[model samples]
Target: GSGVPAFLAKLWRLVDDADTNRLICWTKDGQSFVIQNQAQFAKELLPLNYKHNNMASFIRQLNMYGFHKITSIDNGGLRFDRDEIEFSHPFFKRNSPFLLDQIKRK
Candidate 1:
């Protein structure tokens, strides 16, 4: 019985793809994820996965789940592309999908 939310599963699938770089992917530490190119993510991944393609709507879901945005300054001042975004959640570790069930509303 999978106890994780549907959104969590979809989000993981988006970042789990290793060969593709046109959209989302996990960071090096496997503890967080980055939206590599928001444009592509909106145009392709969003609608395909969640019906609507609104980026803000998607971010809202992350926010509702208490995901934290890992800012540029937080990352040693590394500047990401204007369209890039990063987020992390304690229970959302890559390769440990089962932990996703622990992600809940605060």
Candidate 2:
């Protein structure tokens, strides 16, 4: 498989960290909800060209990488959770990010 896309990598960290830090809470419906607008919270982490990108496509891409679809809250914001270990398997020993960086330098 190709290396992990920059956006996906960034997103993974964001959600993973948020969850780890208790940035979200469980809803009455039994879903964890992030009260903040994730895109805005992650603005600095996103590439400039993707600052205003559509989230649906991003979420779909995450699904392709084995991440579940993040739910949107009433504030029109979305959130993600820690990905299962399966997602890391494809990238294990592959070093996609490093490989991608090397490829771009050529």
Q: Evaluated with TM-score, which candidate comes out highest?
A: 1
Give a tens-digit lDDT track for model 1, residues 1-106. 1787677777766777764465777777787778766676787777767879888888887778888786654355455474257786778785664777777776
| Model 1 TM | 0.77
Best candidate according to lDDT: 1
Model 2 global lDDT (CA atoms, 0 to 1): 0.38
Cα misplacement distance, residue 58 of candidate 1 (Å): 0.4
- All candidates' TM-scores? 0.77, 0.30
For every candidate, C-alpha RMSD to the true structure in Å: 3.6, 10.0
> Model 1: residues >4 Å from true position, as ranges?
72-79, 95-98
Residue-by-residue lDDT tens digits, candidate 2, 1-106: 1665565344345545544344333223323224234454344434343665555554445455443233433444323344311122233222334532222211
Candidate 2 pairs with clashing backbones: none
